[PDB]
Amino acid sequence: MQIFVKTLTGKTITLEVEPSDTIENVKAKIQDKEGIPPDQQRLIFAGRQLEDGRTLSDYNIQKESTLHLVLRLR
């Protein structure tokens, strides 16, 4: 399925993902397009920060959902 990701500058990119994909997998896909290493990424969706071990389905992230990429501080 297709989801949207708001990048660090606020522009939106498109990812091709599956409900069974882990957040870790999604961050890897973001790296391929944005050049940001997974260990420097945090994903925010529906007022929550997404944990790497869980899946997109776990957060009920659906078709055309919009995730938010933020840069890790520490």
Binding site: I44, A46, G47, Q49, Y59, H68, V70, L73
Partner: protein, 94 residues
């Protein structure tokens, strides 16, 4: 919005077990997080006045309603020995 309003007021939302997650304020939540993380005097934290100085002029009516809740989402509240109110980003958002 006054400093006393942000720091005193109790939470009005139920436990996160009984709430359904909503994306309505993700945009504002991210902007608030990024400011406190990178754009304040100290990384990962901001005083009440700093946050107000940054956002009070830019919030709409609906955003004002949930602003304190979003702040409590992102940060823990602290009072220094000098009496300054400081909001520090939770480790999950750092």
């Amino acid at each position: 919005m006054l400093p006393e309003r942000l720091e005193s007021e109790s939470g009005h939302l139920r436990e996160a077990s009984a709430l359904l997650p909503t994306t309505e304020h993700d945009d504002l939540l991210v902007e608030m997080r990024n400011f406190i993380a990178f754009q304040a005097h100290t990384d990962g934290q901001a005083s009440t006045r700093e946050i107000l100085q940054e956002f009070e002029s830019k919030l709409s009516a609906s955003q004002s309603c949930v602003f304190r809740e979003l702040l409590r989402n992102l940060c823990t509240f602290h009072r220094t020995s000098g009496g300054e109110g400081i909001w520090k980003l939770k480790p999950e958002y750092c």
